Design a protein around this nucleic acid. Sequence first.
DNA 1: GCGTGGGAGGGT
DNA 2: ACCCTCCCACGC
Length: 118
Amino acid sequence: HMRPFMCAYPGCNKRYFKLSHLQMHSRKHTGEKPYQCDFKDCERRFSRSDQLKRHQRRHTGVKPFQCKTCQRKFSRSDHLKTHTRTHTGEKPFSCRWPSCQKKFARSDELVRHHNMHQ
DNA sequence: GCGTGGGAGGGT
DNA sequence: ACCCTCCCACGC
Ligand SMILES: [Zn+2]
Ligand SMILES: [Zn+2]
Ligand SMILES: [Zn+2]
Ligand SMILES: [Zn+2]
C-alpha cells in the first residue's frame, strides 16, 4: 500500500505516505493550530502549514498567479480561475425563479440572489 | 459583480 | 508538507 501511515483518531480514516504528513494532520483532532503568523500584530494561527502560507500572501503582497488575458496577478489560483470568467462571459449559474432569467458567474452570487427572492 | 479572505477536502 | 478546487463569508 502506498499510504501506510494511517490516522487512528475516532471517526477519521485519513492515510499518508510520510509519517510527518500524518503527524501534522493528527494535530487537528485535538484542536491544535500550531502555525502562527509571525507578522506584527497578527493573531492568525492555522492547523496546516499551507493555510498559513496562503494567509501570509496578504502581508507580503506576493501574487504568483497571473491572468493570461489582462495580466493581472492574484494570490490564489482558485481566485484566478473565477476571475477569468469575467473575460469569457460564462455564467453557469442560472436563477430558476419565474420570469427572472438572471444568470451569474460565481456560485455564491446565485446563493445571495436566491436569498433576495425570499 | 467580483476581489479576496477562511475553512475544508481531495490529491501528491 | 505542498498543491488544486470548492463553498462560504465580507467588503466596496
Ligand atoms: Zn485523522
Ligand atoms: Zn498574518
Ligand atoms: Zn484578467
Ligand atoms: Zn432571480
